[PDB]
Amino acid sequence: LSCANCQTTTTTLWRRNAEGEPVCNACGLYMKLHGVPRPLAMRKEGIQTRKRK
Amino acid sequence: ARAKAKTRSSRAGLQFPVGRVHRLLRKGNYSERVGAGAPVYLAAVLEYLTAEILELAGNAARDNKKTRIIPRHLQLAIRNDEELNKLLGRVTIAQGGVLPNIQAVLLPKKT
Amino acid sequence: ARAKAKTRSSRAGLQFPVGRVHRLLRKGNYSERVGAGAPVYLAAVLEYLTAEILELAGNAARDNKKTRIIPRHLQLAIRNDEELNKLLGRVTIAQGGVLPNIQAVLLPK
Amino acid sequence: KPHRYRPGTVALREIRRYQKSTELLIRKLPFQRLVREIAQDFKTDLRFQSSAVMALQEACEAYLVGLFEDTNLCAIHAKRVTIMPKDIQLARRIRGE
Amino acid sequence: KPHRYRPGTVALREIRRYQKSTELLIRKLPFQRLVREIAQDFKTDLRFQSSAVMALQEACEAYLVGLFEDTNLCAIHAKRVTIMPKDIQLARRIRGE
Amino acid sequence: KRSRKESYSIYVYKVLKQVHPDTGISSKAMGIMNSFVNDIFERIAGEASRLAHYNKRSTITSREIQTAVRLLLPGELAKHAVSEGTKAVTKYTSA
Amino acid sequence: KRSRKESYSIYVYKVLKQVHPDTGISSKAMGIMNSFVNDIFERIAGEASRLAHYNKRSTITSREIQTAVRLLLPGELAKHAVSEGTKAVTKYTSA
Amino acid sequence: KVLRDNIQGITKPAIRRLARRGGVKRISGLIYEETRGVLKVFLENVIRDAVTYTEHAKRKTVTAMDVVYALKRQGRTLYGFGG
Amino acid sequence: KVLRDNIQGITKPAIRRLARRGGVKRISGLIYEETRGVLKVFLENVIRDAVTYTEHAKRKTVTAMDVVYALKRQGRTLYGFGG
DNA sequence: ATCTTTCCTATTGCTTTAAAGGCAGAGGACTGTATTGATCAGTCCAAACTTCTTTCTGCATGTACATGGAAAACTGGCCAAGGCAAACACGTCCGGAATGATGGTATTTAAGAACAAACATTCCCTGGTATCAGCAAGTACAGTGCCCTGCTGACAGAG
DNA sequence: CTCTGTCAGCAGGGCACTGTACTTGCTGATACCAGGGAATGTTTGTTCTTAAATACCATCATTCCGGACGTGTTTGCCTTGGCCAGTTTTCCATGTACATGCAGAAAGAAGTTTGGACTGATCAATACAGTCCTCTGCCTTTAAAGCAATAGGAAAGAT
Ligand SMILES: [Zn+2]
């Protein structure tokens, strides 16, 4: 699955929007609070920089 | 004139504080004198160990569908790794719990 | 002029060396400074523990009809006393042997 | 007939539940009173930080849990499943306590 | 009939004899050879003081005697008198090794 | 005023971000990591001090720390820690 | 001559003569007793050094040694050693 | 002011839960008194060192550091309390 | 020069004597291999630390003090050879 | 219960080797004075502990039913103890030598100490997202009644 | 008598149904962790000094390797005895579930008390130089312990 708004495959708690499609926790909370979709620029990302055995 | 100051931690490429480690070694009354490379080596070792434990704890937290590491995740990471478990065999972690483990003979039989 | 030197052990009325203990404390990297009474106290404690162990070991040797204390007698003295055994629980005495014990279940009818 | 699980099933369920969780199993106030009583013998009119009592409780729970795993191993060794005072005594004896 | 002690009598005799004495029980030369064999894996051409090998023998026999005491306790706990490998395993597990 | 309390929290968080960019860490876990770092530091420093004292040396150099790490850490942990320590020391000396 | 190596042999022998006038002690027993004295000295000194660093104190005084003795020695030994140390310090202070 | 018989405050279900966390399926009836005695001994041993540390610093309040340190000197190192 | 199989040098009579000192009356046949394995593990653990201590001193002779330090590091303090 | 055999302990003579005592010296303890920095004493305040009060329940206690696990008794066979005889390899010493540990001198490299700048770390304040709580379906698993399928003790009846 | 047909009963095991408990998904509440700004104390740069480690050499001590001889120990084998494992039975002591009330948890407030910051002060430790005498190394002596031989008592096993 993925968020219908910003398309993250991993989230702490899947939710749904008014249309009923799945949305990630941050997007759902942002929509419920402000009435606007969460910007993809506001969405965060990162790449691992260390590894071992 | 004085050159731009550069932290020894950045010089060694570490994230941990070389200066603080050196100061603690000097104030810890461990020896009369401390070599220059001793704090760098110790900081590197500490950074490696904490990176290992954090990696394992993060994997455990991901397994539990949680985003923030908690003491339960640290306990699971430590006790599920043989080397870390041997290193920290005498240590108690607050709110860590225990590994799920039931002796085989205690489980229900079939008949 | 300097007066007649008197060892700090004599002042404290101890057999153990106060000066050597003070020097060991200073050179042991235990503290930046060392109090005057600290070596005296430590020497007194060490002397007391030595006296206790030697008394028990001598009693054990005398019970064994031996004039000189040997490691076996030290082991018998240490393991027959509760406090000393708890203090030296993790210690191994070379050539000390073990206390003679046999579990009562193993004895014959 | 009302439902009734056989002996041992709820025991296994509780084992799984309490091994899955991490909350302190002893009630806080009686343990605090016990700690204060024990400290009363050493020095009168003492005061305790809340974190100090919490640390004492955590250490006691961990120690008892470990002792109970060792006791369970000792009981299983004797071809039993019920822990008995002899099992605890053996576990403490081997550990050097 | 030739004289023969019933089983267990000479066992108790040897127990008393070896608990009374203090001399080393392992033959010195094969233990030295074993020590050298083990040490060669960590560094080639290692010189060994005689006192070092003697100390190793003292420590090893003391550890083994303690382990056998705990093993005998475990054996007696299971209502047996013969020590078995499972008893040593239990003793090591409880001791934390 | 009041005395400031120092800790390793910022450095532990930096290492966590470098390892797991998206995972967070709670305050209790951060305290546990602080305690762990302090414990390992105390162990290694004490062993290095003992090593220096045994050889009648006055300095704790990188060699003492390396030997302490080899003594305390088991197996692969010791090997990887030694590799990281040597890398850090070499990089520091070259700079 | 060889390099001097110090030991507690003569003091242990003097204490033995004080306690058991007509009893001797073998060289192996003297070595064991020397090791015992060194071990107890190390334990008490380490505990006192910790106690001094623990309250941000720079000096190890008689009170630190007394607390170390209280913490380490069990039961009756603790109070007997404390009494002996207090007596020794009282004698020393009066000179 | 005076506390008398609060060792019984370690209730039977509490010991049962502690045993369950240890993987114990069946618990003898006499286990509870033995466990109470063992806990009493352990608490006395730890609190003695904690109170000694408190008395050395001349404080009257037992702080979490003292408990952590008493646990450490007995080989029971505890993480998560400012160690 | 090299040594291959000298773990078998710890003969059955030696293990029997060690058990007898420990108070053991009856010994199972399988005990000897288990005890040999345990002794080998213990010897490797001690000798590794002893050799590390020797190497740190830049020496090539494993002195008794190195063995004493290695034993003390494992909580197995030995009296008689120190010094 | 008494006799025979084995082991253990105790006693006595020789010796040997290890501890007790004596002498030389040096390096480490001791004495005295100046310096200083660590510690002690008094005051204050704030924050953190102790005490008391009310609600509210969850949890401990008490009771009753009954199930299965601990303990005792019996059997046997097989695994280990005891003893004998041959082999071997440990123990003891003696010598060759070669390796490594100790000690001394020139030196050279690296760390302690001091002072100023500034910059990294701590504390304080805010939003916002992960985590907690509650309800409802779905799933997994336990307990149990019924049934089919096997077997076996017993009785009945043809060769 | 042999064997084969017929009854009746108890056992294993499979499967369907009911019921309980745990897991998952969704929504809503909240709390605590990440990010931004003020402050302070601690780290870095630079220079000088000095002392701890390094490199070379000499030398001696002490460990490794080999050899030879004595005999105590190890190892293989045989006999057998008694201890461990399996089976059966019993009963009591634990597990499970239900009902009640009581005190633990949480929140609020007040009291209080004491831990730590701040300032002044005072005194006890360190540094340095000079003196000397106590401890360790070496050597010699003698007595406590070890080894060998003998004798008597205690204990195990058999009749
Ligand atoms: Zn989204």
Q: What are phi and psi of F16, to 5 degrees?
A: -60, -45
Q: What is the DSSP letter of B95?
A: T
Among E49, I44, D64, residue whose Cα is nearest residue H19 = D64
B101, G84, G85 from C13: Cα distances, Å? 61, 11, 11
What is the third-level CATH fold of G2-95? Histone, subunit A (1.10.20)
Q: Are I39 and E64 in contact (CB under 8 A)?
A: yes
In strand K, the nucleotides that come within 7 Å of a protein beta carbon are: 13, 19-23, 25-30, 32-34, 40-46, 51-53, 62-65, 73-75, 81-85, 93-98, 103-106, 113-118, 124-126, 130-138, 144-145, 156-159
Give kind and range of the element (H or E) at residue H27. Answer: strand H26-27
Contact list, H40 vs chain D (CB under 8 Å):
38
* β C68-69/E47-48 pair status: unpaired
Q: How many CB pairs below 8 A link B and G?
A: 3
The answer as to whether E78 is a domain residue is yes
Nearest to G15 among C13, C15, C94 (CB): C15
D83/H71 CB distance under 8 A: no
- Residues paired with F25 in a beta bridge: B69
Among I49, H77, C15, I83, residue whose Cα is nearest residue G42 = I83
Nearest to A50 among B51, B65, B66 (CB): B51
Is H49 part of the contact surface with chain G (CB cutoff 8 Å)?
yes
Query: CA-to-CA distance for I70 and I52, rounded, in angstroms?
Result: 9
B102/H23 CB distance under 8 A: yes
Number of domains, chain I: 1
Q: Tokens representing F64?
A: 């003492």
G39/I77 CB distance under 8 A: yes
State, as a whole number of angstroms, the distance between the CA of I42 and the C1' of K140: 46
SS3 at position B34: strand
In this complex, which residue's CA is closest to the C1' atom of nucleotide K53? Answer: F57
Domain boundaries, chain G: 2-95
State, as a whole number of angstroms, the distance between the CA of C12 and the C1' of K2: 112
The answer as to whether D4 is a domain residue is no
> To which residue do tokens 């706990």 refer?
E77
Query: CA-to-CA distance for F33 and C102, rounded, in angstroms?
Result: 49
The answer as to whether A48 is a domain residue is no
Q: Residue I56 is part of which domain span?
A: 1-83
Q: What is the CATH number of the domain that holds H24?
A: 1.10.20.10
Q: Cα G16–G18–G22 angle (5° rounding)?
A: 70
State, as a whole number of angstroms, the distance between the CA of D86 and the C1' of K92: 20
Number of domains, chain D: 1
Number of domains, chain B: 1
Among C94, D94, E92, residue whose Cα is nearest residue I35 = E92
The three state secondary structure string of chain C is: CCCCCCCHHHHHCCCCCHHHHHHHHHHCCCCCEECCHHHHHHHHHHHHHHHHHHHHHHHHHHHCCCCEECHHHHHHHHHCCHHHHHHCCCCEECCCCCCCCCCHHHCCC
Q: Residue C7 is part of which domain span?
A: 1-107
State, as a whole number of angstroms, the distance between the CA of I23 and the C1' of J39: 58
Taking residue A53's Cβ as centre, other Cβ atoms within 10 Å add up to 7
Q: What is the CATH number of the domain that holds D88?
A: 1.10.20.10
I80/C98 CB distance under 8 A: no
The answer as to whether E8 is a domain residue is no
Query: CA-to-CA distance for I46 and I53, rounded, in angstroms?
Result: 11
Number of domains, chain A: 1
Among C33, G39, C29, residue whose Cα is nearest residue F57 = C29
Contact list, H55 vs chain G (CB under 8 Å):
67
Q: Residue D74 is part of which domain span?
A: 15-97
Nearest to B67 among A12, A50, A52 (CB): A12
Q: What is the DSSP letter of E26?
A: S
Closest CA in chain B for residue H68 = B92
The answer as to whether E7 is a domain residue is no
Among I46, D94, C102, residue whose Cα is nearest residue E61 = I46
Contact list, D22 vs chain B (CB under 8 Å):
71-72, 95-97
Query: CA-to-CA distance for I52 and I67, rounded, in angstroms?
Result: 10
